[PDB]
Amino acid sequence: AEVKLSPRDREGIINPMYDCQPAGAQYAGIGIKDCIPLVHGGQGCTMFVRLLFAQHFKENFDVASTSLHEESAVFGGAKRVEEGVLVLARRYPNLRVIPIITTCSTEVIGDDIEGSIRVCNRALEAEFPDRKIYLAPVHTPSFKGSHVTGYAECVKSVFKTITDAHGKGQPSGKLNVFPGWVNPGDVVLLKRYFKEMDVEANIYMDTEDFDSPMLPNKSIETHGRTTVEDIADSANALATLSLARYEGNTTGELLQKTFAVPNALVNTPYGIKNTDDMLRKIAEVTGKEIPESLVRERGIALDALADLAHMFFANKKVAIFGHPDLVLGLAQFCMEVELEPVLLLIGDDQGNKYKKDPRIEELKNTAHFDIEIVHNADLWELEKRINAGLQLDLIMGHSKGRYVAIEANIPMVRVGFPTFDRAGLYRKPSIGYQGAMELGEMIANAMFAHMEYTRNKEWILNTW
Amino acid sequence: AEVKLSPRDREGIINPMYDCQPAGAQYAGIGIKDCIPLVHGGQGCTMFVRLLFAQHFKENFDVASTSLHEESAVFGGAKRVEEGVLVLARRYPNLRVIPIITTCSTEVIGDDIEGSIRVCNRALEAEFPDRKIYLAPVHTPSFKGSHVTGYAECVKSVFKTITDAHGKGQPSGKLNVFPGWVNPGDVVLLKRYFKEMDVEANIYMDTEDFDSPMLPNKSIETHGRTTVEDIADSANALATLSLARYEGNTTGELLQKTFAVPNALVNTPYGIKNTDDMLRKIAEVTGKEIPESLVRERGIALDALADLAHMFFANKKVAIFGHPDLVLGLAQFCMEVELEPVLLLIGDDQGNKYKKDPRIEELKNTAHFDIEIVHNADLWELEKRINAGLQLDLIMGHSKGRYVAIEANIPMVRVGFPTFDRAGLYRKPSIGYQGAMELGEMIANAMFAHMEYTRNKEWILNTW
Amino acid sequence: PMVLLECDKDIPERQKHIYLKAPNEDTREFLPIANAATIPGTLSERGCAFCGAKLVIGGVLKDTIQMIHGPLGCAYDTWHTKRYPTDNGHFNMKYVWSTDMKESHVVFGGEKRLEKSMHEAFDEMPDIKRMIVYTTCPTALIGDDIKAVAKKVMKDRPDVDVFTVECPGFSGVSQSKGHHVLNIGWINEKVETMEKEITSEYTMNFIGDFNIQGDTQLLQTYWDRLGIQVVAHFTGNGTYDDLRCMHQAQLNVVNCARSSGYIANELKKRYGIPRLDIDSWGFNYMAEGIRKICAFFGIEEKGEELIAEEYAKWKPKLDWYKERLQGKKMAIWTGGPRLWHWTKSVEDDLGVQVVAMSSKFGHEEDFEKVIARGKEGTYYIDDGNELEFFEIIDLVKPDVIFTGPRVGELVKKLHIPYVNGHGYHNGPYMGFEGFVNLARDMYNAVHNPLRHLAAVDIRDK
Ligand code: CLF
Ligand code: CLF
Ligand SMILES: [Mg+2]
Ligand SMILES: [Mg+2]
Ligand SMILES: [S]
Ligand SMILES: [Zn+2]
User: Fold this and answer.
1) Near ion ligand 4, which residues have CB within 5 Å?
2) Which residue numbers delimit the Nitrogenase/oxidoreductase component domain (chain C) (predicted)?
3) CA A160, CA B365: separation in Å to the nearest integer?
């Protein structure tokens, strides 16, 4: 079995898979309590991303703009950054953290972000002697990488900034956990696993409360739960568990280098084996046993998947697109349940890294069929392959690919970010044992509906 | 605004909504640990019901037959009962409870079940001196009522049998809870609610482990968790909370009459208000406060539903079929989210009771449109009304109605029993706050898929 | 020898139902007793005579009301449980009818309730003009004369035709009795009550095939290519009126000799139509069957052209599966015939070793067949029960079990995969392509990552 990597053969993009770096830096920042990111550039760079988050989560998140205009585009934008910092601090008395996120415009014009931070620190210390506001420089030119890389850059810069200020102190006894770019339901699941294992951990960022209640007292609780103090404490951890090579492992590496916190990168926990291996590594680093409750949740997942695999999934051809950790992990999950992930699409310029991902060899050693991995892909690359005759039984990806599946009449399961065209997906785990089960049942239910709509042996859904 | 009840106008049935009484009695019994029901009648009355359970749950459950053959139909079948009890006892050394369930055959021929029980009790006491087996007579002629009535009769008889044997003991401090005929996921939710409220409670029957794991040690855990001890302790409870008028309230009533355990019947907790009212009754009987965690789960439900109600649900016409407590409760849920449940179908001969149900008046004071409630309904009644021009946007019911929705091109959400044509529904709550949310999101997601397959403004699923 | 299982120490009559074939035995001394009474309380797999009439045979028809005279349970229980498609939108699977018998009909009689139901069914679906009425336990016990009601309905509604079956669930010991009653009534009453146009020099009935997942439609592609007219299929993808024309055929080809041999035997007795038994499951078996049909008709070259094309299309795939399935151990726990149609065909064509077989309702004839074709060291069980199944698993350690879904879901807990030996996984399973489909499902069932994952205890270091 041959797993072939190839790049997109076009210079241009049609139907981009990801957003640009600043968007991902905004996503990282909105998961911090008392944080309002400040995006240094034109207004669209902020407002379109606030909309994107509202599409995925059906919630508002606070992000501010420096409002670069023509004057500042010609003569420099440092005063827009500096004013924006001060306006934020003046109007939001509880604000503590401001990642200052660059854009294509402010990278091209060369504004000196670090210098503006010195200016702002002096101004803020004079104006607000009893406050401390953390300003983190986040360099995210949009003409490199993608929102995946921008998320990773922003996490790293905010951790560098806060841990530079606080340093190393008392050991905490806790794990640091970087799950990557996951849903609130994934964070809920991880918190349960650590609780059942009696392992204290901080999950960075803790986005559980993005799914916020509508409460009798009209309070707004739609915030990140990761605090300054949580972030600072990462220097004191027993170990870091990094779940996502492209979405936070570089922070785990920085904490290893700076503070001697050992980083353990594991496969992102999609599917059974990857979840097993994550829990094995947790046990190894903590000395805690895996509890019976997880053996049971695992078993329930396997029971559910066994009702589907040979009956409905075997020999079915799947295309998967999304963030690289998710694509690679879902392809591994698909093979556990006899699906055939023949086309994997990863959407950015990081192919030199992806060729070295150890999961590629893992996929080569477990595939019963050839796999094509297109990197630097756009979603036109999927559509064009289907137009040329690629026969797929299932697509797994985010909602901006929906018209490809709708028009080709292929069932599609919504995974990754953003999933705006279905309800509630942000609350459903995709990682872990429960998440494998939930994914498999979404796949089956999408196939079942498709059998009904297309009258394809719809009578068979009785005694499976 | 008129809520009108009317009977089916045909003598015959086309496409029955429910199974017969003995099938319901079997469902009651399989929730008891160390129980094998013995169905006194021809072999189909057992085997077809074991298949029905496998369709809903994708699991085996043990039920035995007395294998009534021609000679018993001429001379009586007592000896088949007596042999069947002994053969069970001899081959299943851990068996403790045997509900002896009658059928149409054995009701017609008049076999004396209580007399056979006395014979068996003597035989068992002699043969197995240090063993107790509880034989409960369950009279379930199939020519009246339905599997709903049979379920209630079996619960009552088992409770009578076991409490007659043990009596009243010391106060337990606990609630008895009869949720009715619900899924494992509904039981999981209820356990959580009582746990968060610090209320000790036995849920009768506790069917959580019907969703059993596939375990490394190959053990079989697909059993009811309700024990003899648990049942016998019902006599000592603080109070009974009955959630289903037609599915266990009469056992709560028996316990009140026999043991002075006060029974509180509440609306079955579909939707927000009914859940609110359940929790308030729990708080009243126990003196325990409703916890902040439930306020929050409620608020998360409401938040989710608010993203759907006026956009997608308002003025959409719904038909609902299923058990009476589920149909009436779901109609109330639908109104909370702006759906219009215009046709409610309830499938058996208990209309004299249904006309007195307090929920009918509740529906009359909340509806903005006329509701037809057809009792003694079959599913042909639904199809026929659609054929005659009834315009529906949604059907909610069990999977034996699937072809009606498929052929009429109407989205359908699977609720109630049996839901064999989709995966995992047994694990998803329908009751409570989380259940209301999960139901609403199933409805939206079914509508969303329908918009895509039918190209009905499918572009609108972007910025809702 | 005959085997007394540990679980049967207290029901030791079961020994006469279980044969373990050993070297040098005269099998005539070891034929299981079959088709005898069930032991109460055993968790036997058996069903009822009504099932055999309505669910298995009559209900297959595409154009016929299935009027179940009885309380509603018997109807509910036989609806959404079969996989016999049709070419008219699956009318047979979409609907079931009951007379909804109530207590007052037990007391006073159900004949007028039946009659009313019958007229309603024809009024509600005015394009349907054919009906079968079945008794069930209580309508038998109360003595309703459904034949007389049907006579009256036909007199009042001359455009309909109605057939009746007396099949209460307590009749016989199993579903088998329902097959017999239906087969003999049909031939006695309805065969030769109409005729159809004959369009070929070569005509046959195909007797004992119920179109599971399209089996009958797949075989029909063979008959059409050979230029053979099938007067009637009994009953896969059939019509009521085709079955009235069965006397016209030149040849009766039988697959299910258990459920449908009765009608073939009476067609031969009454009309002189010869009975040819074949195996329409199995790759090499299918070729033998086609060659026999074509030798009967004198179209042997056409048969060889068909067989050559089918082997070219399918044999390489079959052989790929044999290479992977060789030596695997299989159990078959189904009704009866599939034991003797599959034991040697999976061995010949796939290299699969059938180690244990159980028949719910087979007769001694079925055991004669299976034991003749089956292996030494294999267990042959009549009327097996659930505790036996566990004991047999421990004895023979199957790699795969072909059985119904509920048993499949039980043995999954033991990490043993299943294929649905009744309704199939991804069928059809008859014919050349079908046996490839069977092999594919067996392969995917056993070559399954979940099975290996289930065995791992993550707590072990
Ligand atoms: S204000 Fe408007 S949306 Fe902003 S960049 Fe400017 S034209 Fe465009 Fe573009 S790639 Fe991303 S979103 Fe920006 S950082 Fe550049
Ligand atoms: S052995 Fe067979 S299935 Fe059983 S009754 Fe008899 S013909 Fe029928 Fe019918 S209504 Fe229910 S399922 Fe029974 S108790 Fe009667
Ligand atoms: Mg299961
Ligand atoms: Mg919300
Ligand atoms: S049977
Ligand atoms: Zn392999």
Assistant:
1) A 58; B 303
2) 48-446
3) 61
> Is residue B174 included in any domain, yes or no?
yes
The letter for the amino acid at A50 is R
Q: Using the beta-carbon criterion (under 8 Å), do B424 and A441 form an inter-chain contact? A: yes
Q: Which of the listed residues C173, C193, C213 is the one where a domain comes to its end?
A: C193
Total domains present in chain C: 2
**Domain check: are C89 and C209 in the same one?**
no
Q: Would you call C16 exposed, middle or buried from its count of C-beta atoms within 10 A (0-12, 13-18, 19+)?
A: middle
Question: C334 CB less than 6 Å from ligand 5?
Answer: no
> Do B236 and B359 have their domain in common?
no
Nearest chain C residue to B385 by CA: give it. C124
Q: Are residues B122 and B249 in the same domain?
A: no
Distance B58 CA to ligand 3 centre (A): 5
- Please tell me whether residues B63 and B120 are part of one structural domain: yes
Domain count, chain A: 4
Residue A295 and residue A247 share a domain: no
Tell me, in angstroms, the distance from the centre of ligand 3 to residue C449's CA. 17
Task: Indicate which atom in ligand 1 lies nearest the CA of residue A19.
Answer: 11
Residue B7 forms part of a structural domain:
no
Q: Cβ contacts (< 8 Å) between C137 and chain B: which residues?
A: 41-42, 68, 103-105, 108
A residues 345-404 lying closer than 8 A (beta carbon) to B:
399, 402
Chain B (31-60) residues lying within 8 Å, Cβ to Cβ, of chain A = 51, 54-55, 58
Backbone phi and psi for residue B414, each to the nearest 5 degrees, phi listed first: -85, 115
Between CA C132 and CA C142, with CA C137 as vertex, the angle to 5 degrees is: 95
Query: Does residue C175 have its Cβ closer than 6 Å to ligand 5?
Result: yes
B34 and B147 in a single domain? The answer is yes
CATH of the domain at A147: 3.40.50.1980
Q: Which residue has the tokens 């009549």?
A: C382
In this structure, the number of other CB atoms found within 10 A of the CB of residue C236 comes to 25
Method by which this entry was solved: X-ray
Is residue B425 within 8 Å of residue B414, measured between CB atoms? yes
Range of the domain at B460: 269-315+432-464
- Looking at all shown ligands, the one closest to residue B424's CA atom is 3
Q: A120: CA distance to ligand 1 center in Å?
A: 25
How far is it, in rounded angstroms, from Cα C258 to Cα C206?
Answer: 14
Q: Are B51 and B91 in a shared domain?
A: yes
The residue among C160, C193, C226 that closes a domain is C193
Residue B13 lies in a domain: no
Task: Give this entry's resolution in angstroms.
Answer: 1.2
Q: Which residues of B66-98 are buried (b: 16+ CB within 10 A; e: fewer)?
A: bbbbbebbeebbbbbbbbbbbbbbbbbeebbbb
B50: DSSP letter = H
Q: By the 8 A CB rule, do C282 and C341 touch? A: yes
Measured distance CA(C64)–CA(B444) in Å, rounded: 38
Tell me: is residue A59 an annotated ligand-binding position.
yes
- For the Cβ of A179 lying below 6 angstroms from any atom of ligand 1, the answer is no
